[PDB]
């Protein structure tokens, strides 16, 4: 697209993009293990939260919908799901240790999932392709050059698989019981 | 190497060995950035600690002393030094984050350093050797099969270098400098 338009930003490249439309279908759910109250009022208190999270990452590309592949082997190359939280406004981000042997995912609060060694099999139909550009539909980020990024370029190998392993950051906002 | 002696606790191989004897020469030192005082008692109070660590890992092998090599490359290959603390003790172990942009280490101690992609150059003289036993003389541990241990077996390549990257855990107990 020709750049015609005089935006005060200083004539940057356009935001027109997207070969592969990566979309998290990851969902998070939590329940309190212990609810308390003072009977002097009706002031309930839900506490001791117990989080769980499930789903997958799909990707629309050339009118076909693919699903991300994880690695179920036990080496350094295990696609390790690691939950991240911020006490700040995302100024920093710390890994959740297991407390009482569960992931305390407290309702609202902001979370992020990190999963390395992801892939996709786009099929022999899509072999040997260069500059496939991955964009997120819903706040998924891709790791590159030591830093998170809104989009990344991948090439497919002779079979149609992304030639090198990805690493994703997935947003999480739990639902709760009640 | 022959079992004569009836110890309680089954009978098991001896622990004595060490083809190559690794020693941490890592030292840690800290100062409070603010020293304060309760004049009604005269009880001083140190706070805002500022830790620094320095040193090397050496190793004795076949009468010669070698020194560990780190990897400088910007990337996934980089020997990442990560400071490491246990809250109270044992099962707890978490990454030490920078506060006030510096690594506060309190002289009460209980810290460990973790460093990947280490190596050694044992010299052309020690090429092509097949199974070498690594031991520490001062509490350095080596990573394998997802867990630390005090010994590992490695082989040298055509040049005399450890064929594969090591990953170490180094103890440190800081000292207070006035």
Residue numbers in the entry:
A (entry chain A), B (entry chain B): 32 to 209
Reproduce the article's own wording on this structure.
S-layer proteins (SLPs) are self-assembling, crystalline proteins coating the cell surfaces of many prokaryotes. We determined the atomic resolution structures of all functional domains (I-III from N- to C-termini) present in the three S-layer proteins SlpA_ac, SlpX_ac, and SlpA_amy. The Lactobacillus S-layers are anchored to the cell wall through interaction with teichoic acids (TA), either lipoteichoic acid (LTA) or wall teichoic acid (WTA).
The arrangement and architecture of SlpA_ac and SlpA_amy are highly similar. The N-terminal part, exhibiting the first two domains (SlpA_I and SlpA_II), is known to be responsible for the self-assembly of the S-layer protein into a regular lattice. The crystal structures of SlpA from L. acidophilus and L. amylovorus and observed crystal contacts reveal the self-assembly formation. A second interaction was observed within this crystal structure, a symmetrical homodimer interaction spanning from Asn92 to Asn176. The self-assembly region (SA) is formed by domains SlpA_I and SlpA_II, building a 2D crystalline network that forms the exposed surface of the SlpA layer.
